[PDB]
Amino acid sequence: SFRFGQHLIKPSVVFLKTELSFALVNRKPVVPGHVLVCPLRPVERFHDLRPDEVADLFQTTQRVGTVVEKHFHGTSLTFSMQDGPEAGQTVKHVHVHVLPRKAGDFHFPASWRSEEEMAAEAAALRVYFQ
Amino acid sequence: SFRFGQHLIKPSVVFLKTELSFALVNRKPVVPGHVLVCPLRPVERFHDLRPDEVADLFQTTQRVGTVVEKHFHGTSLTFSMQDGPEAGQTVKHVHVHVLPRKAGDFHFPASWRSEEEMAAEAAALRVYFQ
Numbered sequence A, B: 001s002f003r004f005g006q007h008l009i010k011p012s013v014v015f016l017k018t019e020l021s022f023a024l025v026n027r028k029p030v031v032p033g034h035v036l037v038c039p040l041r042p043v044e045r046f047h048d049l050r051p052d053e054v055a056d057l058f059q060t061t062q063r064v065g066t067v068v069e070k071h072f073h074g075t076s077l078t079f080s081m082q083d084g085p086e087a088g089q090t091v092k093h094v095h096v097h098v099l100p101r102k103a104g105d106f107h108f109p110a111s112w113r114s115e116e117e118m119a120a121e122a123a124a125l126r127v128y129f130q
């Protein structure tokens, strides 16, 4: 129901939606609580966003960071946007990576989990935005 | 004339100032064109910023990124905010690192340069915001 590049994201893994942005959980989060915040409009580069979308994207990112930091017990946050092919972008849609951090944390297999586990995680996250 | 944690930044190295933010060049940029965008108000964590400051911080960051990417000839940009002690924050002031990226780029000595070279670089950057 949500667009993220050329794949549709099921609303079950989406925990926040604003007039212009949405936040979703990852299939293979690099650290517990690694989430993404993206503009609803699928643009490829950061410069394509309107001032409206830029503000909303980052106000949402601030709200999400506070929540994931709280829920996954981090003491800091790393926010990062890989803007472009040479930056590391894989999917052509601007998005911010929000990763809760903690001391000593360091930063289809791996961190992989089921869709249901993602939906469970997203449901726990929706509680903080009620 | 500008505050960045507990040190004053000379206006000569500052290339953009808005009602709520400013952008400055680095002493030891990690890649050519690595600049910083920070809120004028010296806050320690991202969550301390008001919605006002959040929007402004990131609208400015979008403008700066477009410029540094143009000037230093990058084809992408990496934006990053180390929010907190466990994230890597060194100076207690929220700020975004804007780093122009290009193919094969990889990502008091080193990249070190004089204050005058920093002032020269900032002056070249001010031209794009005229």
Ligand SMILES: OC[C@H]1O[C@](O)(CO)[C@@H](O)[C@@H]1O
Pocket (backbone or CB within 6 Å): A032, A071, A072, A073
């Ligand atoms: O995923 C983070 C969540 O998992 C726990 O460690 C297990 O319930 C919680 O205290 C926290 O809220």
Ligand SMILES: OC[C@H]1O[C@](O)(CO)[C@@H](O)[C@@H]1O
Pocket (backbone or CB within 6 Å): B032, B071, B072, B073
């Ligand atoms: O620092 C980037 C600048 O330096 C040059 O390589 C040397 O003048 C330019 O073309 C560019 O504008």
